[PDB]
Design a binder for this molecule. Sequence first.
Ligand SMILES: Cc1cc2nc3c(=O)[nH]c(=O)nc-3n(C[C@H](O)[C@H](O)[C@H](O)COP(=O)(O)OP(=O)(O)OC[C@H]3O[C@@H](n4cnc5c(N)ncnc54)[C@H](O)[C@@H]3O)c2cc1C
Length: 391
Amino acid sequence: MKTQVAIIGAGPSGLLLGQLLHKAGIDNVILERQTPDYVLGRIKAGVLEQGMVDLLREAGVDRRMARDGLVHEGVEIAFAGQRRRIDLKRLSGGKTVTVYGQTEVTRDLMEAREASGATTVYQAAEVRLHDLQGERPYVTFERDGERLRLDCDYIAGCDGFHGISRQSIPAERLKVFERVYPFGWLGLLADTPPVSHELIYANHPRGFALCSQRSATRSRYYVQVPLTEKVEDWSDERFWTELKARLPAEVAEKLVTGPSLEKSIAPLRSFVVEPMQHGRLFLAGDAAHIVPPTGAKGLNLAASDVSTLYRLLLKAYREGRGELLERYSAICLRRIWKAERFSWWMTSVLHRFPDTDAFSQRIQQTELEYYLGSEAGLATIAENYVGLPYE
Ligand SMILES: Cc1cc2nc3c(=O)[nH]c(=O)nc-3n(C[C@H](O)[C@H](O)[C@H](O)COP(=O)(O)OP(=O)(O)OC[C@H]3O[C@@H](n4cnc5c(N)ncnc54)[C@H](O)[C@@H]3O)c2cc1C
């Protein structure tokens, strides 16, 4: 078969890019290793930036989000006795964030695509990329036991952290920057009313805790745990008792608990690769960079990469300006590093790190006291949280 743009991965990155391209008249094919329900089983992101909200609207897949998403104007940080609210809307100059689950965004995009009739091959096994630097690259894969070949002009690697795309670039061509954190996040999804109308990030001596939500009758909670923990060692009971222990008494007493729908541990990591492209292969989303969940930047960075790729591909196709695709990495990397810095900062001030001396503990506390007490400090958090402008 043949197409214009081959997309590896049917996660939100690939589906969004595919939708934007299809709409602009650029044919694309999406190859996914797993099945539709496997993809739909991933409970991940809950917070979207305005830029991503507008892109969904531009892709024409915002009906349900507009109806079901929750717009938030503030967020809270609880630390050593106090709870401080950051008014995102006034400190950022009017911007807000939207709480709408990643499973939901994915479902909406999958429906949009199924209806458009664009090509999507699930269970595409053994995907391999070829002739990345030639004029006619191609992808080979197996559907059943037959190896099919797909010819194309460009390939977008939207296959996540463990995808084949990033592995397909000569190692010597890429420079990696990575930081692994000595802890993960144990998350629990429950069909219970959230404890607050806004998110609560808590720095507690026992470790980090976070109170989030998906809707008015569905919550998502997290607690920082050592990388040596097993989710099977965390019963629902143990989770709730631990969560309550890390929250302000007044918050903990309002908590409606309940049986988990999902429980999993996500280890924290920072990862960036430079550049984000090779020949006719362009990386997007988790395939090029990972940010710890603390700043709620991952999916939002994927959205900006995609927005940039989509627009550079449009110029190349409709305007015949193929030369602009060479500036893809420079453009994306500017935003990526800024968000990595914020996610890193958020992570360092909200979590309890092992083997930290007295001095560094006091500084972590003072960082919070200063940034949450200064008008200028609050503004740096707010403008970064709502999302820095797209370039
Ligand atoms: C606990 C947690 C909380 C988070 N919270 C937020 C939040 O609130 N806001 C936010 O912005 N970000 C958040 N994120 C991050 C966000 O979920 C990711 O950045 C986002 O999933 C990236 O989407 P993607 O399409 O690049 O990759 P993925 O979701 O990883 O999808 C990639 C697709 O590629 C497929 N694939 C893999 N390898 C192959 C192959 N060889 N061939 C074919 N297909 C393949 C995979 O099966 C997958 O379906 C969070 C993440 C976690 C873990």
